[PDB]
């Protein structure tokens, strides 16, 4: 049952919206800098995962991906418009995308994931 949009409240790892799978974009909005948005996806077989989150508003945002044990495995790079990154998933399991805005009023976004998901 893959998601095409966030489902609030998703403001902690324990309420993360998902699963997110490749080929199905996921919409949402960072309501303001207090709105944390967490998502999850499931790695079934080891392999590369690529993440691109399109910024559809103004502001400074970023993401980090945590594995099931709360280790950071990937950090976004901002190109101005898109927040992107990739990592090698050596173990199957659930991964959590933590998306937040450190400066900005309101930010619609679109999440795309690719690879071993």
Omega of the bond prior to 19 within 30 degrees of 0, cis? yes
Examine residue 11 and tell whether it contacts Ca ion (CB under 5 A). yes
Owner of token pair 């508003």: 57
Examine residue 27 and tell whether it contacts Ca ion (CB under 5 A). no
Binding residues for Ca ion, total number by CB under 5 A:
5
β strands within the chain, DSSP E? 26-30, 37-43, 47-55, 60-66, 72-75, 77-78, 82-89, 93-103, 107-115
Question: Which of 26, 35, 61, 67 contacts Ca ion by CB under 5 A?
Answer: 35
Cβ proximity to Ca ion: between 61 and 117 the closer is 61
Query: Within positions 46 to 75, which residues make up the interface with Ca ion, using CB under 5 A?
Result: none
User: Can you give the binding site for Ca ion, defined by CB under 5 A?
Assistant: 10-11, 28, 35, 37
């Amino acid at each position: 049952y893959p998601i095409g949009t966030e489902k609030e409240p998703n403001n902690s790892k324990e309420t993360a919206s998902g699963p997110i799978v490749p080929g199905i974009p996921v919409s949402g909005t960072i309501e303001n800098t207090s709105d944390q948005d967490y998502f999850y996806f499931d790695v079934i077989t080891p392999g590369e995962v690529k993440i691109d989150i399109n910024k559809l508003g103004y502001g400074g945002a970023t993401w980090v991906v945590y594995d099931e044990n709360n280790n950071a495995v990937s950090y976004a790079t901002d190109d101005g418009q898109n927040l992107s990154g990739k990592f090698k998933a050596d173990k199957p399991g659930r991964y959590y995308i933590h998306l937040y805005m450190f400066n900005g009023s309101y930010m619609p976004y679109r999440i795309n994931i690719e690879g071993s998901v």
